[PDB]
Design a protein around this ligand. Structure first.
Ligand SMILES: Cn1cc(-c2ccccc2)nc1C#Cc1ccc2nc(C3CC3)c(CO)n2n1
Ligand SMILES: [Mg+2]
Ligand SMILES: [Zn+2]
Length: 313
């Protein structure tokens, strides 16, 4: 009832900042997430015994892959927490509630392979879900954990609030499909610039929550350089394993996934910052001005990749 979660001082302060790293102590990550729900949503959003049981089933359903693991789930939710705390009054009670959960769940049961590798391997999930294959699976796994006994953290919501919150979570998780990001950002750019962007238009809110989801999902490019650079090793560890598997199916993988083309990593990061990360955080900053630190941190890391190329590290 009167049972606040507290963090040591350095964490209590740094968790409010966009560039926070949740640290290497896995056993503190659930405490961090509950702390964020309590401050973002209130101590009354969720029955604590249910939330804790839900967090631990979510954790169990993430796998020990190098990048798309439980640490990423909690990192992406912390970024969403920072956006919600710096844009307090722009979001409904239900949006606050759905989005942190969506972020914790957005990569449930990921195997460390792209939608592309599933389709070329001809994985059962690719016939059940022809587009956003893994992302429809992540949502399906979320609804499964919600229907386990003692796990329905949304039990107190009305029939119709429950359905809105599962619909916010479904669109939030689908939007983490980066193939959908490009179109969704282009539309958001045009609506903002011609002045048509309207946050009372539910289809516009959808778009805006989708862009936040892409921003939170890519938030490793907004950390301090030593965090960003070591995360790149985890990311390439998956991409190269998928490369290996492509070659096993008789297919030349794209260079990004070819461990034989390691040399050209720095130049490939530039591509990614310019083609994906910078545009994402630019459009997000225009629509939500208090998210600017994400843009500035991204630009700092692009500039660190330029330095890697010029032999200066
Ligand atoms: C487009 N491309 C081409 C090549 C390439 C070409 C030739 C030889 C070697 C590599 N590499 C890339 C790349 C990338 C990439 C993709 C997703 C992603 N998410 C994140 C953080 C949010 C987690 C990072 C940053 O690490 N990334 N980075
Ligand atoms: Mg994903
Ligand atoms: Zn993700």
């Amino acid at each position: 009832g009167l049972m606040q979660f507290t963090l040591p001082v350095r964490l209590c302060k740094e968790i409010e900042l966009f560039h926070f790293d949740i640290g290497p102590f896995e056993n503190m990550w659930p405490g961090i997430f509950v702390y964020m729900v309590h401050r973002s949503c209130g101590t009354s959003c969720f029955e604590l015994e249910k939330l804790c049981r839900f967090i631990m089933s979510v954790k169990k359903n993430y796998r020990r892959v190098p990048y798309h693991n439980w640490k990423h789930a909690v990192t992406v939710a912390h970024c969403m927490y920072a956006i919600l705390q710096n844009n307090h009054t722009l979001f409904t009670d239900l949006e606050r509630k759905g989005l942190l959960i969506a972020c914790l769940c957005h990569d449930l049961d990921h195997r460390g392979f792209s939608n592309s590798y599933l389709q070329k391997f001809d994985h059962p999930l690719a016939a059940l879900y022809s587009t956003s294959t893994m992302e429809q699976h992540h949502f399906s796994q979320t609804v499964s954990i919600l229907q386990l006994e003692g796990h329905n953290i949304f039990s107190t919501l009305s029939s119709s609030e429950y359905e809105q919150v599962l619909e916010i979570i479904r669109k939030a998780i689908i939007a983490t499909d980066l193939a959908l990001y490009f179109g969704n950002r282009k539309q958001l750019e045009e609506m903002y610039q011609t002045g048509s962007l309207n946050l009372n238009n539910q289809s516009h809110r959808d778009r805006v929550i989708g862009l936040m989801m892409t921003a939170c999902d890519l938030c490793s490019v907004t950390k301090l350089w030593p965090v960003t650079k070591l995360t790149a090793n985890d990311i390439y560890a998956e991409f190269w394993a998928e490369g290996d598997e492509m070659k096993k199916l008789g297919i030349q993988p794209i260079p990004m996934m070819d461990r034989d083309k390691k040399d050209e990593v720095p130049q490939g990061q530039l591509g990614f910052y310019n083609a994906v990360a910078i545009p994402c955080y630019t459009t997000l900053t225009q629509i939500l001005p208090p998210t600017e630190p994400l843009l500035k941190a991204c630009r700092d890391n692009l500039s660190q990749w330029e330095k890697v190329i010029r032999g200066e590290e």
